[model samples]
Target: DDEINAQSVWSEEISSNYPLCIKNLMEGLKKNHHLRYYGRQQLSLFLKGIGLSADEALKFWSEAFTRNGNMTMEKFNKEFRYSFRHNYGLEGNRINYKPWDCHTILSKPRPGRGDYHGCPFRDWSHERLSAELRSMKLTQAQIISVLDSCQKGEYTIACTKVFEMTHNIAHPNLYFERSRQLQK
Candidate 1:
């Protein structure tokens, strides 16, 4: 059978326990205290697609949004809970949504003030993107490769390079599954 076993345990030495890309997004969210509509949609749907239950998604968002004490849990419950559930098809239109792919993310309108949506490779200035990669501890050569790919309008390829550099990874799910396999 080509099925993964239920009790298969994964290792942490070969792969990071946390998703590298998701960590980047969480860093952005934590720094800003809020993400605009599309920002929320992109991150939320990505979380759901990565196998977070509705309850976990709500808690994760609540903690991220309220960690700085700017947004109260009560406020988050009233304002953000339903939308999180909506992504799971438990509310409103009941569409069990999937996360946006690289192309879909790139196709989004450019982010403006206070917005953090869209593909960073396609949207970030070269200096900013380079600086971001630096903070992620990428070597200068690797950083140049990523920037070169982006400059060539190969945004997805650039991101794939980042995944390889990060996970030591493809589609986001491919990134995740491969990381899990490597961990094991």
Candidate 2:
């Protein structure tokens, strides 16, 4: 991976391949500040979250991955293909792994720089979080509380705190129902 960031995470390029994972990935960048999940597992989880099917995923990855990097299609199929299937539970035990939740995502081990897959709140330092909090027009007390939560390793809790301080009413439960239906 010599590129600045991997496709489906930070890549600005996209195609109308009749699947939505690509679009979701793009939108994910908007929300997550373009933090790409460099790991295959992380990327796969995201793809699945956005409704990437198994067959489409194979095709989707084959096109971008080989062309952008040194790995040939043949080599990629041999080395990388199984992992995708494994991630989707198509191979092996077929447990059909679910996509990582916000909590699970943010709680992962820190990926080295140039790699994605982490909680911005936890992976990013308190200082950085503090700076971002200020930009959001947070009160001094709220900012400190958020930073304190970050310091305490309460990454999800910290995020929840932001929402509590700020605001949001959209539940959109149907969206989650669709996600569940897509899982099997």
Tens-digit lDDT track for model 2 on 9-97?
A: 23332222212222334344344433343445655666665566777776655655565454678986897778777777777574756
Question: Hey, what RMSD does candidate 1 come out at?
Answer: 5.3
Model 2 sits at a Cα RMSD from the real structure of 9.1
Best by lDDT: 1
**Candidate 2: stretches off by over 4 Å:** 1-38, 67-70, 102-108, 127-145, 161-184
Task: State in Å the error of residue 161, model 1.
Answer: 1.8
Give the per-residue lDDT digits (tens) of candidate 1, residues 21-89.
444465678797667788898777766665666666666677777877879889988998777777777
**Backbone clash count for every predicted candidate, in the order shown:** 3, 0
What is candidate 2's TM-score against the reference? 0.53
**Cα-based lDDT for every prediction:** 0.69, 0.55
Q: What is the lDDT of residue 175 in candidate 1?
A: 59
- Name the lDDT value of residue 132 in candidate 1: 82
State the weakest 10-residue window (summed lDDT) of model 1. Answer: 1-10
What pairs collide in candidate 2?
none
The 10-residue segment of model 2 with minimum total lDDT is 13-22
What is the alpha-carbon lDDT for the whole of candidate 1? 0.69
